[PDB]
Write a protein that binds this ligand. Structure first.
Ligand SMILES: CC(C)(COP(=O)(O)OP(=O)(O)OC[C@H]1O[C@@H](n2cnc3c(N)ncnc32)[C@H](O)[C@@H]1OP(=O)(O)O)[C@@H](O)C(=O)NCCC(=O)NCCS
Ligand SMILES: CC(C)(COP(=O)(O)OP(=O)(O)OC[C@H]1O[C@@H](n2cnc3c(N)ncnc32)[C@H](O)[C@@H]1OP(=O)(O)O)[C@@H](O)C(=O)NCCC(=O)NCCS
Lengths: 397, 398, 398, 398
């Protein structure tokens, strides 16, 4: 049977240390989930699982989907869990939810994600048995995880930015090419804001009191010349570095939720199914070239769906970094026109990259922009730390 | 198409701060995975995904399945990921493996779990912005996580054990019977050791001294009801009628479980020996203060979908999180004495240990291998889940 | 048996907690005050026989910090130095120590001083060397933690210093209005002293990267009784009648203090101009939860030693650890509204701040300088001390 | 003015770092030693007027530690106390301070001592107060970190005090054997003193949980040049010609020392037996990288003040932080093999350990008591000081 996506929503995306620095991952997740049940008006015991992507879990919220479920007031009968495939986690939680709906096990599930990167822990694996001999280390959960993701034989000291410079260097991507993508990314998001199509995805959030409904990172005044004045983060290590804060996705706080269900049950509950899952694909690449993950994964998803990238009307590619994104679009042999059907309400550079919540944000816009365009096929894909890719093909209902 | 389970193996299980204490969660999973491929002889490019249950992740190993894959020397073409549903995470990882294999998306994946409770980090949410005004609290991941799993509206200061006491209380469960179970638990494990059946199950783990360890660290031959009665209930100081001790509780432990999830065709094509196939599974939400009873609704869901009853099930694995917890489920299953002879035949949580993430894969290793050994048909694996859940799968022999 | 006289007592400005000197260390600040003291006086660095520094939150960044400040300020390697701790009374303790060492003949000229960077005081743990497996791990704020442990296992004070302030508030029936009035008056005197130009006489301007700072950051031109009334007591939750706030407490701050201690003969030999001499000093112990009354017996000891009474005393620096604390002390002294006219005349801990190690030398700089402008005779410096102590000293104008 | 005599100088046994007193804090040790001293002297607790303790790794578990040891030992709340640090000379410094303020007529009886738990020195961070997102967060071992900071930023020494020992080995052309011979001799005197029952008057035995300990952990009767010859010089990777090993180095250790400082009259009135009086003392600064030669200029200062020469000293205590270091001092002292028999007759830093803050009162224990046992006249106590200082006292038999 088919699994359709209904009402994919998200909180606004906050900056790192910004408007949402007060709220936990659970706080953001609860808000998106209650917001979701509010719009759909569906009984809480219609929900058979809350599966969330969450890339920096800690014991503040074990098996977070169940915690977000209980903290949103859902009955104790609603199960929940946590998944982590880095950047892809949110799509992973949607694909899993589709698998257990299409298989007949479940009729309705919540698939989503929650990340508060402002509150990702520092931690130590040296404090339990003694730091006498070894010394004690305390790691920044964000930084550390970005050098360790490829395992001990595959380290990347400079993390995700080092990988983005790897691609820049491999693919001869100019610094101007990267700042150009960055500015245009901001335009789309600012345009989408003013057009009012973002109120359709966004579950506003109350903070200690004010209620925020706009995203924190997109800037109206962003320009190419302005971006030119920024320092490439790894410029010391690399005279030919290009990747800066301006052409990189930021760190951010958000949550994302959607209903995954069947057409019959959606009809029964008065829901409006936007898209259905067609195919998906997962790929592994070299950790130091992670950014090219979207190419082998997209291949597999398209192949499964018997389509070509030519058959795809709309694309969500996350853009962890301009350089990375440009490397994927180069493989895809893209023209200027293709740019007009890719990330048309923004991307990670302009909207931010609240990692576990990013998969569900691309889904919100992809699903929604498809119905308003009355287009047919949609592709969602993302590079993944440690060297993976993930792509799903969605079809409008 | 079916999803079948091949060569499910595990490490030995070390105690907390014990023999595998210098070994990380990745170390243990790499050993287990490397052992799986060595026995099965499959080319490493045949693996399409490594899905691991892993309950105290940190940035020493993000999306851990991927890291285990790489550190085992698997092609960088092999994806992997990490799942958390507390105790039920090793089976969760299996079920997910079955779903994406039965769906036709994949022909072969690895499902397992990995836990080093010995090396679970200490963490703080106060260092990023500074403790100038608030101070800096550092939490024990193990200790903190027993409080939080039910959220802010369903508080449990004493965690899973406090809920194990609640079951003793609501179910009228005596310490004697609790300790009688633990005793039974050790000599089924200790039996199963001398009978040499753990041999098929276990990937011997080499440690620098260099020795190879191949026997589980917690089982004890000299366990008796009398010796256990001497044990102080952990929550005695708050509770007069308290019964739950270290002796009828599962410990904190270090291990990894690995398993091949594929189709009957692919396994024939690779010379594999499928043991069980997935018949059904179920998940259930219960009260966070009474988590222990989670297997009961979950099992009925799994049984319902299968078209079976608990009579149809010949072999049972229940993780014995606590004796009281386990007895309460068996009391709900209206269990008798002969029912015990089909339940937990190589030991369980109290004797073998409970390395949370790897537990669903130990139970699977036993269920599948013992079903085959006895030429029994149906097996049931089920487990209570911190926070108040239950998961259960029904497996059928091939 | 010679006299001990004090020459050119100076200090840095006093920065706010997390304020204008946050990127500077206890040593940086001490190096500035010392270089300024040598630069004004012109004393040859190899005339300095010891650099004795009161310093309340030492760590291994700067061991025996008087030595480190001496070295980092460019003094020869022949100049010895050390660190002393008696909490708030450390800066005075270091002067009293210098006086003893000079009156005896062992030395002729030393530097006595203090240095605190509360902005940069460490967080620490005594659980991580051998592990928190069995105990758990704490990370302690050296500020907050030191304030509850100061009185030992038999006299713990969970609410720290603020708690002791409240205790003095209750015992002496001290109103919020009163404490807020003292504080307002404290800022007034500081802000005026500043406007009148007298504070620049004490101050060594500090280079901070790039500018030069020469003005105390903590005082406020705009303090009112009405503004103060708005503030919520730190301990209001614990105690409905709590009165101690941010506004009527001393601040946590960054500064350093230094002065020459030498003999009359020696000052004369180098053509230095002594400001005051040590008449007497006393120290005393009180209940740790009543430390704040420490100055009362310490003063009585110092007076009796000196054959004086508080009526012989033209000027008083009594550190305002807390308005509730300063008011209690004066109550034991039975103070007039007129008596405030001779007490803390350019401000104190509440308005200028309380860089704990350095505060003793701040009070001395004021006291000694202001004894000359009024052409008074006797001055008293005294301080309550966490853990329940007091220190007092009588200085006489030369 | 009046004289100052040292009564009943005692210590705890000295424990190895991570050794027998690992479980005890510096306060635990300071209390043990202070109670010992109080019970042995029968003095009334309210007769102590100040507890001045050398303490070289203070943290907020025990602020102004003299007062915490005072209160936790059961002294009245009326007894003041403090902490001093001049690194390795810290415990002598406390004696000298106590002396100054008895001779001044200020106090009639104070306690001077030192206390170190190097087993439990804290881990600390300057990176947790204002946040670590842009810098990261580091946490330092207080011991390891102190190895490089004592000399400030203009006189770096990467390998700390050990490197310093190598520098004195290099410049004085001191052989590995000569070094190791001293170590052996250090150990024989230690063990010999145990057998002769002479230590039983220095030592206050220390109860530890699950028994009473009375004997130092580090001496070993079996020490030989041969055994020592096998050890690898700590810094051989950098220096092909290194000599300094764990065997001819002084160690990291745990102990407290206490003694009484009073007048001759007060002693008599209280039944005390005055052992010695402090003739004079001297301090000095030397180049940080030539740290261990500190005792050479400080001894000459102290001897000069006393009107004595090094010939006039019957007993020398020299803390031997390293063999190479001690020997360089002895060389400058023009020692002959006969001079070795009046120097450190019960062991030294190498055989008993170097519990930094308590070393001073250990040397003082042995020096006072061996001057009475030998019917001699003048003792010299001197030690080098990390950071590049020297400190010495000359005492006289009463
Ligand atoms: C983007 C990132 C590099 C930023 O790091 P950062 O140093 O915190 O950067 P900031 O946002 O503080 O920006 C630095 C400055 O650039 C400024 N800036 C941004 N756009 C600008 C423009 N057009 N002109 C001028 N300045 C600009 C910011 O305002 C900021 O200004 P300030 O320093 O004056 O306040 C980092 O957040 C990041 O990308 N990491 C997460 C993503 C990642 O590593 N990988 C995950 C994907 S796999
Ligand atoms: C009292 C104490 C807890 C203050 O906490 P803090 O929040 O870090 O200090 P702050 O400077 O931020 O003051 C807090 C608030 O009170 C306000 N405030 C302080 N003094 C004020 C005054 N005279 N008038 C009006 N408002 C004032 C501040 O503006 C601030 O408000 P804000 O948050 O809106 O900016 C801390 O300074 C303390 O412990 N002091 C005692 C130090 C001590 O024990 N010394 C040893 C003596 S034994």
């Amino acid at each position: 049977r088919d699994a359709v996506i209904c009402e994919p929503v998200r909180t606004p995306i906050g900056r790192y240390g910004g408007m949402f620095r007060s709220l936990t991952a659970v706080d953001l997740g609860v808000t998106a989930l209650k917001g979701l049940l509010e719009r759909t008006g569906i009984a809480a015991d219609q929900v058979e699982d809350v599966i969330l992507g969450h890339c920096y879990p800690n014991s503040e919220a074990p098996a977070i989907g169940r915690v977000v479920a209980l903290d949103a007031g859902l009955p104790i009968t609603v199960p929940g869990m946590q998944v982590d495939r880095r950047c892809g986690s949110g799509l992973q939680a949607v694909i899993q939810a589709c698998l257990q709906v299409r298989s007949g096990d479940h009729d309705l599930v919540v698939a989503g994600g929650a990340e508060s990167m402002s509150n990702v822990a520092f931690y130590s694996t040296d404090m339990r048995w003694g730091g006498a001999r070894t010394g004690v280390q305390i790691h920044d959960g964000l930084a550390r995880g970005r050098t360790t993701a490829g395992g001990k034989f595959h380290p990347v000291p400079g993390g995700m930015l080092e990988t983005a410079e790897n691609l820049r260097r491999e693919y001869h991507i100019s610094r101007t090419e990267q700042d150009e993508l960055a500015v245009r990314s901001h335009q789309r998001a600012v345009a989408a804001q003013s057009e009012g199509v973002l109120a359709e995805e966004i579950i506003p959030v109350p903070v200690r009191e004010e209620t925020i409904s706009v995203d924190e990172h997109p800037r109206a005044d962003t320009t190419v010349e302005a971006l030119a004045k920024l320092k490439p983060v790894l410029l010391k290590q690399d005279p030919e570095a290009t990747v800066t804060a301006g052409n990189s996705s930021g760190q951010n706080d958000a949550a994302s939720m959607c209903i995954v269900t069947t057409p019959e049950k959606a009809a029964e509950l008065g829901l409006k199914p936007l898209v259905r899952l067609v195919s998906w694909g997962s790929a592994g690449v070299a950790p130091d070239l992670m950014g090219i993950g979207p190419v082998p994964a997209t291949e597999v998803a398209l192949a499964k769906a018997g389509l070509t990238l030519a058959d795809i009307d709309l694309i969500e590619l996350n853009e962890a970094f301009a350089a990375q994104a440009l490397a994927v679009m180069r493989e895809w042999k893209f023209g200027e026109a293709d740019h007009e059907r890719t990330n048309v309400r923004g991307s990670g550079i302009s909207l931010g990259h609240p990692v576990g919540a990013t998969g569900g944000r691309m889904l919100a816009t992809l699903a929604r922009e498809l119905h308003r365009r009355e287009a047919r096929y949609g592709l969602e894909t993302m590079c993944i730390g440690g060297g993976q890719g993930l792509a799903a093909v969605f079809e409008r209902v």
